[PDB]
Design a protein around this ligand. Structure first.
Ligand SMILES: Nc1ncnc2c1ncn2[C@@H]1O[C@H](COP(=O)(O)OP(=O)(O)OP(=O)(O)O)[C@@H](O)[C@H]1O
Ligand SMILES: [Mg+2]
Lengths: 279, 103
């Protein structure tokens, strides 16, 4: 039998999708991720309401008082503000429906309005296994939908990075936001250390290829989510053909930042061009 | 006359049915009546916001936006409904009256 390399044509498997559920990796990496509450399985009344077309408001099916009180209970336990998510996706495509233009939710209605008007959430519900050769999508084993409520916090989009891992080795990472920040190039070596050390804490993760989203605040690289190593998840500043082409043997990852002088800067730059004449 | 509005009174018209042709040869689903306490998705220019339908008369509707929007009276609007986990275009309208945020 022919020994396959570590650059072969990527495919998606049932398991890969299952391991990437919030409940799946959260049990494993609770210590490394900011405060969250998971309602599993999602109250049947909430789920039935999500499948109903249009988006009817209480202020026509609406969820049972039991579920609303349950969601609202979890919200106060998370400081009154929360960021909702189903098993994998947050409703970031539906911030237009929100009063504040953000995923911040105080009311259980705020949560519902978002999930009910998001195509990413609609993907979670119907197309989670649309690419798995492992599973036959006709109607998905011992699986259930879950409502994740993550405690809201003022998170700066500047220090959010998407980190690519092929065969337990950090392949590359990039900025998650599409705006330029000058301070990133200055601290990139430190962020690279912070994110590489976090990966050391992710050796328990079931698959050898995954995309972990991070949030760096102070000298902390917080784990935000684990997305599959498949073009389904946005390669951002990297093409999925580039990610396949990368050496999973190389000790150094490829970093990508959003792109945009003193007498000192000039000759510190002219000191490096002196070391290009050497080695 | 541009201003920031929270509630808008629209003169509308709905489609007989949803856009497209079903590959089966089947007819697209009929666009149903505007319903109170239903959140639509209104395109007020470049602005995309939700609009809670509070009341309807004939070709008249009173919508209360999810957040304040920048427009004028007589602005052409596109009404959309969440059908089959897709934002389907249900009709078109024009602002007739509006309630400003503070003035
Ligand atoms: N607790 C939080 N407080 C504030 N903002 C948050 C919080 N969690 C996430 N966000 C914001 O939501 C965005 C998406 O969050 P998250 O990474 O958890 O969602 P996702 O849908 O799984 O990601 P993706 O769809 O890109 O794979 C983040 O980039 C950030 O701007
Ligand atoms: Mg994700």
């Amino acid at each position: 039998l022919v020994p396959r390399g570590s650059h072969m044509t990527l495919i998606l498997t049932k398991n890969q999708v299952l391991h990437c559920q919030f409940s799946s990796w959260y049990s494993l990496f609770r210590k490394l991720t900011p405060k969250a509450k998971v309602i599993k399985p999602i109250p049947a009344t909430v789920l039935k309401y999500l499948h109903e077309d249009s988006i009817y408001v209480e202020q026509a099916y609406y969820p049972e008082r039991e579920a609303i009180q349950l969601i609202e209970k979890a919200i106060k336990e998370l400081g009154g503000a929360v960021v909702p998510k189903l098993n994998w996706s947050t409703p970031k495509d539906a911030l237009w429906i929100t009063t504040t233009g953000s995923l911040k939710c105080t009311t259980a209605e705020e949560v519902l309005l978002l999930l009910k008007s998001s195509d990413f959430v609609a993907h979670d519900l119907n197309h989670a296994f649309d690419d798995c050769k492992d599973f036959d999508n006709a109607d998905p084993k011992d699986f259930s939908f879950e409502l994740v409520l993550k405690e809201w916090f003022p998170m700066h989009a500047s220090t959010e990075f998407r980190c690519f891992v092929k065969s337990k080795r950090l392949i590359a990472f990039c900025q998650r936001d599409d705006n330029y920040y000058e301070f990133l190039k200055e601290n990139i070596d430190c962020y690279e250390k912070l994110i590489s050390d976090l990966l050391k804490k992710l050796d328990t993760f079931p698959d050898p290829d995954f995309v972990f989203d991070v949030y760096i605040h102070k000298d902390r690289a917080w784990l935000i989510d684990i997305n599959p190593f498949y073009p389904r998840t946005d390669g951002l500043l990297f093409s999925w053909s580039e990610l396949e082409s990368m050496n999973s043997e190389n000790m150094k990852p490829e970093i990508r930042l959003i792109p945009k002088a003193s007498e000192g800067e000039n000759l510190l730059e002219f000191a490096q061009k002196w070391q290009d004449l050497t080695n | 006359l541009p201003n920031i509005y929270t509630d808008i009174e629209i003169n509308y018209f709905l489609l007989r049915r949803l856009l497209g042709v079903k590959t089966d040869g089947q007819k697209q689903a009929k666009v149903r009546k505007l319903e109170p306490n239903e959140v639509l998705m209104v395109n007020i220019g470049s602005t995309a916001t939700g609009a809670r339908v509070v009341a309807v008369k004939a070709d008249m509707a009173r919508l209360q936006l999810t957040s304040p929007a920048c427009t004028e009276i007589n602005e052409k609007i596109a009404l959309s409904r969440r059908i089959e986990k897709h934002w389907r275009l249900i009709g078109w309208a024009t602002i007739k009256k509006g309630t400003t945020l503070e003035p």
